C-alpha cells in the first residue's frame, strides 16, 4: 500500500535506468528537394519519393 522506509536515490537511478529516450537513427533524404525527412513520411515541403505529392 505504502512504503515502510525511505527509498534510496541510488535505486531511483536503477528504476530510471530503462526509462531513457531514444533518438532517430537516420533521416530519409529526399531525392528531388534534396532534404532530410522522416523515413516513409513526406517532407516538410510536400515531397515524398521525389515527387511533389501535395501542393501546400
Amino acid at each position: 500500500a505504502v512504503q515502510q522506509n525511505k527509498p534510496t536515490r541510488s535505486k531511483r537511478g536503477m528504476r530510471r535506468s530503462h526509462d531513457a529516450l531514444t533518438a532517430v537513427t537516420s533521416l530519409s533524404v529526399d531525392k528531388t528537394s534534396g532534404e532530410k525527412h522522416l523515413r516513409h513520411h513526406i517532407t516538410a515541403d510536400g515531397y515524398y519519393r521525389g515527387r511533389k505529392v501535395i501542393a501546400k
Binding site: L38, H40, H41, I42, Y48, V53, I54
Partner: protein, 119 residues
Amino acid sequence: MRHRKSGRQLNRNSSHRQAMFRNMAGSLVRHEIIKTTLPKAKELRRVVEPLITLAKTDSVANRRLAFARTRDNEIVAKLFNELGPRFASRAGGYTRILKCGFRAGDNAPMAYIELVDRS
C-alpha cells in the same frame, strides 16, 4: 483476444463509429484530400478503402447506400456522375496515404488521405 477479427473500436461506441464515417467519407469525396489521424486512416482503410467500393457503378437503385450512411444526396450526384467515370478501369486501390507529422495539441499521428487520380 481478437483472432482473425477485423475492426478498431476507436474508443467510441458503434453508433458514433457509424456517424463519424458519415461526415469523414462525406467530405473526402468533396475535397479529394483531407488531413486526419493515422488510425483514423488505418481503420479507415477498412472503411474508406471500402467507401470507394461505394463508388463503383451507376444504376437507379445504387443511389442509396450513399444516401444511407451519408445523409446526403449531393455527394451521390458527384460519385456516379463524375468519379465513377473517372475511376472506370481501376480494380481497387483508389487512394493513397501520406503520413504527415504529428498533431500539435496532443501528439496525435496525423496523415493525409486522398484519391489516386486527384489531378
